[PDB]
Ligand binder design. Structure first.
Ligand SMILES: [Zn+2]
Ligand SMILES: [Zn+2]
Length: 1287
């Protein structure tokens, strides 16, 4: 196991475990430092790391060392012996904590035993040279005050106190002649500057610290994890695998881009979690290869090492044994060393993916930041780590006896207040970007707050390089993962090979490169007149010295007046906020405005189903104006059009290389090897797809998801800025009152803030879900497809290359060049489905992805909608849509296809969509209105079939056809095999539900069936098992095509395609969502209109109509006349019969031209009696259950109700509406609903039953029943003349 030694700073120097060390960077000069051996090969020097720094640099100044850190200075830290000792005791406690668990102990053991090779790149393969600064460090033996005697020692890690910035922990390696042994396989003495008291702070963006905003949200780090993070770097450096490779470099061209140092992959490996995914597979293999290469050199050296020219006492064997074990080399029974691929693999993955900050945190139940790419907050001071009441070896801050184990409460700033102290901002220095307008006003923004957008140069272009294929060529996959449970249980991982003595010859060649550091401006001034996220967030703040503020919806005034604060909430919310009231009304007002705040914030849960968008936060644009001027116009509309892309501050230029060409190695007369070469080129092909995807994922996370993170953060701030402003206003108004009045005011500030903060949390959850959706959306629609294109391109090139290859070997292959000739087609036929969990195991990311793929609306691969007098694809896949002159469009999303040649729409689908899921899996939906047949043309109508929508490529595909009263769906596989399913509606119904009426169609295709649904109901099914591959991504042509009558036309609306089979539940739902409207519809399904002639239809008496009775002021009910001709194919009841009614608007006499009738509207139901416009009235004083309606000239009589409220009691789709007579627009006194009632009449000659246009109270209770009774006589529909219906 590991032994942690004990000592006090004042303990005597014994030249063994407590020495006067001459640090590597001292260049063998200057003073020595009292060093303590905390364990074998590991030293603690309780002093400030001054190497490469300036003395004054230890004081806070207008400069900074790192552009991404809220740096804290304190030159007094460690300036006394008691401070040094507390440092020592604290280091000893952290080490005990670390070893308190199997995982940390192994990290320590790996580090103790990972002794640097005795030499570096300059040392001859046959030598061991300990006389170099990265292997030996001197200790002064001589008595106090004389560098007369000094001895050398071997060491692995020397830990110092902090440098100028206390919270800037760093692990440093030794470079000599511009090279680093710790990066070339040898390893070398590692150094670290660490501070256990001043730790970093962070918060879970996709969460909330104890659901408290007006608190000290965020969490503070466990210094033991911070230490282990650094120890991991030490581990890497000791094993010499701390190599440099293509680094992630931030794009810094735009003022909104965050500036930061290049990030090496080793850094992201150390953090673990999602970070490794930012390193593409290409660069992963590059690093892997270089590390393997380094190990080969070391293993070669072990086979050639003969002597140590610097220390005659060094035992060659002892070391060859140690290094063999360190690098896990294998040895034959003869002593020859060689690299065992499997053991190298396990060791490499262990070091790079096993020991990660993320794995350790999870194992020690410590909370840490979600990613290297997260905003760093100000650091805090841990009062006393040595106090077991605050921090223990076993549990850190999350002590269970204090009930602080659960949810990392012990690290929760808003909970464990007694464990830390905020820091003096006067000692903090943060890099700031001063944004100045070319005039002027200037806003300071912390560089940490900007958008981190990785530059294109960050990603490898290795996919573009050629690849030779051979019978032995194998795949290459490096999983940025490693089972932590096996690393903890692995038996033969921890060296059971003796650690050599540390004493050796003293170092005489102090040649070494000492880094030189210097601060840089903490403020960078840039000029811009842009008012993006930064300016918008700023406009929502106010100076500390101002206490009387007012809200405003005007961004410009807000920026202008310090007492004016910008608010993106409603106009009403803003007015109420600035409302001043009496003391006696204050409480009420507070309850009101707080309530409003919550309502406004909760609008973040807005739905937009009609636009196929489940979630939308309508105020994001107003709040931040991030991306493409999202504050101007209507955000929701702009989002329906451009999607997630509009929110991005910057659209990145993706690196999507053309996959390199495969060069196959031939083998004349060699059947096996040629077959292998082929099968290997096929698997290598898969490595290319996976790699491409990984390259995509890496760019998404570092160029896109980053931006979406800043937006989440920006929203969190905006919401808090808003709550802070309202709280400021509340406080101000309250304190204006006298103490006497305040005493009687019933207000609870904590409860107020409580409700505000709660509203904020609900908003944040919504926003995070919305934004995550956007980020995944951008990945799947704006990035993956661009990769699929290149991959499909490469695939084709690879196909011809494999066929041609099998062709040239037509001989050598014998009777098989055909078998595989297809084996090549069936493989390059199925495209690799993208799966994020393959490139990362980050839980948040996977869930993000799974959630997205569980939402059926994300399966929409074409969604044609009306926008600015044109049709466009809003699915986000960017299909090109050509609408020709003969197509009529309206803002109701209706489009008309006529018999004109130019009446067509051409859609060029996105060829890079996994539409061809190999088993035919997709759906098509849309609304359609098919006109009635011409009576004098019924023969043609029933016999002539004409295509209306055609999607063909290579004589394969699908099409929607119509032959009279039948709508047909047809499939055609590559072999010309055709299958069809269809829906036919009756054309002999007295009243048809489908002829000339809008209805919803949905066709679904799966491996077995082709189903047709109408208005959500399954109508037909056809077995499509026999059918083979169907090419469905060809062009889509919308056009009447076949032998049609010149008068033939068709209306369509909401045409959509899904790359999956919709369930009946999805269909019914889509049916209900697209049927919904605030307005009533007419008999055809179009919006009901004011000032438009309409015949009336009654759903409870289909074949009935209303006619003013000759001698009475009543409407008698007559039977509709029928189709007169003798066609055997058709029958119907006349629709254009009875009185011609016309609906008039009751309110606002803005004249009488036309407009839309909305549910609940108060109207006048009139009709035309010759040249006069009469009206429908109800005698006011009837006592019976019902009465006949009174039909007479327009007049305002005191004895008749003349006002009707058009209603819609049905919750399900319907074109029926109801008409209600109320006492007046205000009373709840309902007189009854309009309907039909049967009366008995017995005269001197005639005895019969006759129906009359009536008003009945009976309907009042009937319309409330469920399910809605569509057969009720109070259900009416309005039929205006329509070219689609002639009789
Ligand atoms: Zn690091
Ligand atoms: Zn960052």
């Amino acid at each position: 196991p590991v032994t942690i030694n004990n000592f006090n700073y004042n303990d005597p120097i014994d030249n063994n475990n407590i020495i006067m060390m001459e640090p590597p960077f001292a260049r063998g000069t200057g003073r020595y430092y009292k060093a303590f051996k905390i364990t074998d090969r590991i030293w603690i020097i309780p002093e400030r790391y001054t190497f490469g720094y300036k003395p004054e640099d230890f004081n806070k100044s207008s400069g900074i060392f790192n552009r991404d850190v809220c740096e804290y200075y304190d030159p007094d830290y460690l300036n006394t012996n008691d401070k040094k000792n507390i440092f020592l005791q604290t280091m000893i406690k952290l080490f005990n904590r670390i070893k308190s668990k199997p995982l940390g102990e192994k990290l320590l053991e790996m580090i103790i035993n990972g002794i640097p090779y005795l030499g570096d790149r300059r040392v001859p393969l046959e030598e061991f040279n300990t006389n170099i600064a990265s292997v030996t460090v001197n200790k002064l033996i001589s008595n106090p005050g004389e560098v007369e005697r000094k001895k050398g020692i071997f060491a692995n890690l020397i830990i110092f106190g902090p440098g100028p910035v206390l919270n800037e922990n760093e692990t440093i390696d030794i470079g000599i002649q511009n090279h680093f042994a710790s990066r070339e396989g040898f390893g070398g003495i590692m150094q670290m500057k660490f501070c256990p008291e001043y730790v970093s702070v962070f918060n879970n963006v996709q969460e909330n610290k104890g659901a408290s905003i007006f608190n000290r949200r965020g969490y503070f780090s466990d210094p033991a994890l911070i230490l282990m993070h650094e120890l991991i770097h030490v581990l890497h450096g000791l094993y010499g695998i701390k190599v440099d490779d293509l680094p992630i470099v931030p794009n810094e061209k735009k003022f909104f881009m965050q500036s930061t140092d290049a990030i090496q992959a080793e850094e992201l490996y150390t953090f673990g979690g999602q970070d490794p995914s930012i390193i593409t597979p290409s660069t992963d293999k590059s690093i892997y290869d270089k590390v393997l290469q380094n190990f080969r050199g070391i293993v070669d050296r072990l086979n050639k090492v003969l002597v140590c020219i610097s220390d005659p006492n060094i035992n060659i064997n002892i070391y060859k044994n140690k290094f063999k074990d360190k690098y896990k080399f294998v040895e034959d029974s003869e002593g020859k060393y060689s690299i065992d691929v499997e053991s190298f693999d396990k060791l490499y993955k262990s070091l790079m993916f096993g020991f990660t900050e993320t794995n350790i945190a999870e194992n020690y139940k410590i909370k840490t930041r979600a990613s290297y790419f997260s905003d760093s907050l100000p650091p805090v001071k841990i009062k006393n780590l040595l106090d077991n009441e605050i921090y223990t070896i076993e549990e850190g801050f999350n002590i269970s006896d204090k009930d602080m184990e659960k949810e990392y409460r012990g690290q929760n700033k808003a909970i464990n207040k007694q464990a830390y102290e905020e820091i003096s901002k006067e000692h903090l220095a943060v890099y700031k970007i001063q944004m100045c307008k070319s005039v002027g006003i200037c806003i300071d923004v912390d560089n940490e707050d900007l958008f981190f957008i990785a530059d294109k140069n960050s990603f490898s272009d290795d996919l573009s390089k050629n690849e030779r294929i051979e019978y032995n060529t194998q795949s290459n996959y490096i999983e940025n993962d490693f089972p932590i449970n096996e690393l903890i249980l692995d038996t033969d991982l921890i060296s059971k090979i003796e650690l050599p003595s540390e004493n050796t010859e003293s170092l005489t060649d102090f040649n070494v490169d000492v880094p030189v550091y210097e601060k840089q401006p903490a403020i960078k001034k840039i000029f811009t007149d842009e008012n993006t996220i930064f300016q918008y967030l700023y406009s929502q703040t106010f100076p500390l010295d101002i206490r009387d503020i007012s809200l405003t919806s005007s961004f410009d005034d807000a920026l202008l007046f310090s007492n004016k604060v910008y608010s993106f909430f409603s106009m009403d919310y803003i007015k109420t906020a600035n409302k001043v009231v009496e003391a006696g009304l204050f409480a009420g007002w507070v309850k009101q405005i707080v309530n409003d705040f919550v309502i406004e914030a909760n609008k973040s849960n807005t739905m937009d189903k009609i636009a196929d968008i489940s979630l939308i936060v309508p105020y994001i644009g107003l709040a931040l104006n991030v991306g493409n001027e999202t504050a101007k116009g209507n955000f929701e509309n702009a989002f329906e059009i451009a999607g997630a892309s509009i929110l991005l501050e910057f659209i990145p230029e993706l690196l999507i290389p053309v996959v390199g060409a495969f060069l196959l190695e031939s083998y004349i007369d060699n059947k096996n090897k040629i077959i292998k070469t082929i099968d290997n080129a096929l698997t290598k092909r898969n490595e290319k797809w996976s790699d491409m995807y990984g390259l995509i994922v890496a760019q998404w996370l570092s160029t896109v998801n980053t931006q979406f993170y800043t937006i989440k953060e920006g929203m969190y701030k905006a919401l808090n800025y808003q709550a802070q402003a309202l709280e400021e206003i509340i406080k101000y108004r309250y304190n204006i009152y006298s103490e006497k009045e305040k005493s009687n005011i019933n207000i609870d500030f904590n409860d107020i803030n409580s409700k505000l903060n709660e509203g904020i949390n609900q908003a944040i959850d919504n926003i995070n879900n919305f934004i995550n959706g956007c980020s995944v959306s951008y990945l799947m629609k704006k990035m993956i497809p661009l990769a699929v294109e290149k991959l499909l391109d490469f695939d084709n090139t690879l196909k011809k290359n494999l066929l041609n290859y099998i062709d040239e070997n037509k001989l050598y292959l014998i009777g098989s060049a055909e078998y595989e000739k297809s084996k090549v087609n069936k493989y390059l036929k199925t495209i690799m489905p993208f799966d994020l969990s393959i490139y990362t195991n980050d839980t948040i990311l996977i869930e993000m992805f799974n959630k997205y793929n569980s939402e059926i609306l994300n399966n929409i691969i074409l969604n044609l909608r009306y926008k600015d007098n044109n049709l466009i694809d809003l699915s986000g896949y960017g299909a090109k849509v050509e609408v020709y002159d003969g197509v009529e469009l309206n803002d109701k999303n209706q489009f008309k296809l006529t018999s004109s040649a130019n009446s067509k729409i051409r859609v060029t689908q996105n060829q890079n969509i996994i539409f061809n899921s190999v088993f035919l899996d997709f759906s098509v939906s849309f609304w359609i209105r098919i006109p009635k047949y011409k009576n004098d043309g019924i023969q043609n109508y029933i016999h002539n079939e004409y295509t209306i929508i055609n999607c063909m490529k290579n004589n394969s595909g699908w099409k929607i056809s119509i032959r009279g009263n039948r709508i047909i769906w047809t499939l055609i596989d590559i072999n010309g095999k055709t299958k069809s399913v269809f829906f036919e509606y009756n054309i002999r119904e007295d009243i048809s539900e489908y002829i000339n009426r809008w209805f919803f169609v949905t066709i679904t295709n799966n491996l077995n069936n082709a189903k047709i649904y109408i208005n959500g109901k399954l109508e037909s099914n056809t077995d499509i098992k026999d059918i083979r591959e169907v090419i469905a991504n060809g062009e889509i042509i919308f056009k009447l095509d076949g032998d049609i009558d010149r008068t033939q036309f068709i209306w369509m609306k909401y045409f959509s395609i899904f790359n999956t089979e919709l369930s009946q539940s999805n269909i019914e739902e889509r049916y209900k969502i697209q049927s919904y409207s605030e307005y009533l519809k007419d008999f055809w399904g179009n919006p009901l209109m004011y000032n438009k002639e309409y015949y009336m239809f009654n759903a409870g008496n289909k074949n009935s109509y209303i006619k003013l009775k000759k001698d009475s002021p009543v409407g008698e009910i007559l039977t509709r006349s029928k189709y007169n001709q003798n066609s055997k194919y058709i029958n119907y009841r006349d629709l254009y019969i009875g009185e011609k009614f016309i609906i008039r608007r009751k309110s606002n006499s803005q004249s009488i031209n036309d407009d839309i009738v909305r549910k609940e509207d108060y109207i006048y139901l009139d009709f035309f009696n010759l040249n006069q416009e009469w009206r429908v009235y109800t005698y006011k004083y009837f006592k019976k259950e019902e009465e006949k309606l009174f039909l007479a000239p327009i007049s305002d009589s005191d004895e008749f109700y003349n006002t009707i409220q058009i209603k819609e009691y049905d919750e399900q789709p319907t074109y029926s509406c109801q008409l209600l007579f109320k006492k007046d627009e205000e009373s709840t006194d309902e007189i009854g609903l309009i309907g039909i009632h049967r009366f008995y009449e017995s005269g001197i000659v005639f005895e019969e039953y006759k129906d009359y246009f009536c008003i009945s109270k009976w309907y009042l209770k009937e319309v409330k029943r469920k399910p809605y009774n569509l057969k009720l006589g109070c259900n009416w529909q309005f039929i205006p003349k329509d070219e689609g219906w002639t009789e």
